[PDB]
Amino acid sequence: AVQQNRKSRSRRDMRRSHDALTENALTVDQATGETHRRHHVTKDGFYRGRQLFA
């Protein structure tokens, strides 16, 4: 139910050794020149040579 001894600050940092974040897949849409998330519509509505909500 509960610990008998407190955890050292070393064993607490050893558990967090898998807690790191990674980056996303970002590409340059040289149809428009901007940076965008791969396979996603850009911030203003562009994708692979088409524009939504002109």
């Binding site: 790191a20 974040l21 996303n24 940076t35």
Partner: protein, 109 residues
């Protein structure tokens, strides 16, 4: 020469912000701005605010060029907590600490 920006009193804990601060430490300023732009974490917004402020200070007060800049230093410290009460079952009461942080960015060529 490093140019500094401080964001004192962010309403997040330092353990949550250190994860985003580890992602951009030592990178070029444009790449770090991209990483922060396309993040779903809440600490990314505050860290992007502090980084934008450091770039503006470097270019206005010190008159530096931006494509040469780097995120040379960044670290997160703890702020002062807010103490609150949470009623529990059977008449018991727990103490809630609402945590705070200080973000410090240093941009340099």
């Amino acid at each position: 020469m490093e140019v500094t920006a401080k964001l004192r009193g962010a309403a997040i804990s330092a353990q949550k912000a250190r994860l985003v601060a580890d992602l951009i430490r030592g990178k070029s300023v444009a790449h770090a701005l991209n990483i922060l732009n396309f993040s779903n974490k809440k600490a990314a917004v505050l860290v992007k605010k502090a980084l934008e402020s450091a770039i503006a200070n470097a270019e206005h007060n010190n008159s530096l060029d931006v494509d040469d800049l780097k995120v040379s230093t960044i670290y997160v410290d703890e702020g002062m907590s807010l103490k609150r009460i949470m009623p529990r079952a059977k008449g018991r009461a727990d103490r809630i600490t609402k945590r705070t942080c200080h973000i410090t960015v240093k941009v340099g060529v």
